[PDB]
Symmetry: C3
Subunit: 145 residues, 3 copies
């Protein structure tokens, strides 16, 4: 996956960012069975005042998570994952759930590239990693915490 | 909805931002019947020179709106809304129409969390909101402009 | 199309940004027949350390390319296009392929607006340009490099 996490400038310290990325990644691997290192968390910070809710300028406490996934998972599984991300990001970022928005977009695996490689179908990550070249797998493996 | 609005830094004053967010929110509500507080407008500012049309670096005079919606509206209605967003943003931001791009993506409502809550199907929003907890109805109700 | 390119601050000099933006524009133009002026590259810079892979904080080397296309192109052409974006962004940005992620999202042309105008199907581009006014045509012809 690629999770675009849209937050206000400095609402998450370097270390808060690490735990938010940790929670998003662990929720993904735990619920989909995809390797930790396939989860990309991409923080987009902006100055406070760039978020408007119903036309009202907002402070620095809103969080939008835009997830980009492969097609192939069920509406049930996707709802569990969206609810776990709301839950865990809440505890990692110490933010009320009322502040958290989470959208999942889906694309065919055949038009999705991670680490310069095309992704397999959901659940086939096992064989697909074994097929990767030896220093491809190595580079991916250096991104697990 | 979530409207990602991509503009160059310093292009939009704090009130010009207020006008654009208000022009986008009013369009969406006036055409979908979705409550004001459900319209998030998320200004993503970048230094001018970061936008390339046809390989040619641009100044600060381009706006790109990316709207994220539930599925279930007609192509006819989506055309009207996007055309309204183009026109009303032209006025609100004092920019010629030929510089605005507007894209809409749609997802199943079952994988779309606003305010920590999954969304109803389009048109059922008065009843979904009446059933939410009153702590939260109250929280959203302050986001009306 | 709109190509959202997420990079870390100061990874790309102006010359390198121009070259990345050019590699993406001519890959698209090349494999689709879409005019040079119709391709937007939108650069999104974030401080180094804002990208996490498997919860591991990254340097300035990741690059995420999010392409927003209209529907109707074949899975074969989209893969070719992503693979070429990988290859030519690797070269233009002097960064190896395993740092490059490339996703394509698709939308009905009828909810997509370039230069203030709705786009046609992919199999109607030349007709579409020969249907715009003189001011439009001449103002898009300014965006060729």
């Amino acid at each position: 996956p690629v999770y675009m996490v849209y937050v206000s400038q400095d609402r998450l310290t370097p270390s808060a960012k690490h735990a938010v990325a940790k929670a998003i990644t662990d929720a993904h691997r735990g619920l989909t069975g995809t390797q930790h290192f396939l989860a990309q968390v991409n923080f987009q910070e902006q100055p406070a005042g760039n978020v408007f809710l119903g036309g009202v300028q907002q402070g620095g406490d809103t969080i939008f998570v835009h997830g980009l996934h492969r097609e192939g998972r069920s509406a049930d599984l996707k709802g569990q994952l969206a609810q776990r991300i709301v839950d865990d990001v809440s505890v990692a970022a110490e933010i009320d759930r009322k502040h958290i928005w989470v959208y999942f977009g889906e694309m065919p695996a055949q038009q999705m590239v991670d680490y310069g490689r095309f992704l397999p179908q959901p659940g086939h990550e096992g064989e697909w990693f074994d097929n990767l070249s030896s220093d491809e797998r190595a580079f991916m493996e250096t991104n697990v915490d």
